[PDB]
Design a protein around this ligand. Sequence first.
Ligand SMILES: [Fe+3]
Ligand code: NA
Length: 449
Amino acid sequence: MNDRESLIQALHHTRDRVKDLVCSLREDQLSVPYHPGVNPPVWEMGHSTFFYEVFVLNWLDGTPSYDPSMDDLWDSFHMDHEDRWSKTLFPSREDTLAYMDTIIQRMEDRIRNQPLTDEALYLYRYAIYHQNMHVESMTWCRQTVGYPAPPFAEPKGLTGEGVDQDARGDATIPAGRYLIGLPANRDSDAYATEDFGFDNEKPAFEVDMPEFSISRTLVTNGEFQKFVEEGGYERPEFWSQGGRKWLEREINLNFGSGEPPLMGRQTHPFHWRKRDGRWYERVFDQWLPLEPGHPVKQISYWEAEAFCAWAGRRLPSEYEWEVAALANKPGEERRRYPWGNEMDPAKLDMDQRYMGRVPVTAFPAGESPFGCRQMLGTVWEWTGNQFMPYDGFSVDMYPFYSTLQFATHKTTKGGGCAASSMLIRGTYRNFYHPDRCDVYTGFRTCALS
Ligand SMILES: [Fe+3]
Ligand code: NA
């Protein structure tokens, strides 16, 4: 993203995604069932538009807000979760949509009629990417509450490709010194272009990495089935202290199913169910069959932890992951994507299309330098580190972005089927709480020592 055209086109694609997400719903559906990981769809439209007004329009020009009264109800730090479900505090779908279209145009007008300063470019890209972050959240809200799939989605998956080849195997990464992260904004003149990144990715550093071997494929449903069948969820030997506790919790196992509440402990991935001997998976409003060569998704950090124990494998660190995905070494050329530094949306399962139902050996054009496949895309891969600041951290213009979720969260890397590709990078770092089954998470195993 440098050209105004790319920005403007990205602005438009984003607005459509939000509009398609809210208007494809009926009035009786606009109020979503309460869940700690979902938000009301109209609020996400308003909140994601407010960001433009705050960190682009007012930031650079001093312009006032569309409606100053809502300046505290759109803010995420102030407006608490539970009181977001109000019907008297917030405007209607009709007005909120108009708000968006206005600010979108106001954004387009500035991008066109005001200098392309590196400052503007940076803020332009930040604000857009933020809305895409809420496009993902809105998409998994449907899965959580059990609503129909988004109109722009092909949840059935990649049909025909189904042909898991022999690419399955491990890749021994040679030991040596490798480069992890992005330059700091103050040290680069491409901070808005070729060195763009959030605070969590900066400042860069070098690491002397020991040799290791990571699976070129993700863990598939079939493999996880054996762990379940061998009694994994009932053999506490494989689970850790948090895992054991997670396992001993009572939950409505029928959430987002349309069926009455059924409270109990988890014995299989939350979204799995056995029907007359056949494993099935809830895909929004439809229970489809569980293809075996597809990757296991919507699992917890604990669930993966136990599998790695039962399988005699281990989880990678985020620095192993980045090495194995980009293979950037100090002094040599640098890549942002495993294939290179140019983004083709066709080399990865992203942008809310196949939504994870892809064979784990597919997308060979996105092969990592060490053979690793489907690194960037499909699901967010669990790592074994805790989200912590890189040594040298500097808060961003929006300082709550990463600071609010340190230590309590685990670093996940890669990209989600529900996440827009325009914001992904090998350096990118996401942060999810280990107890979560609602986000599009996955994992691959690394070899033991
Ligand atoms: Fe936000
Ligand atoms: Na991935």
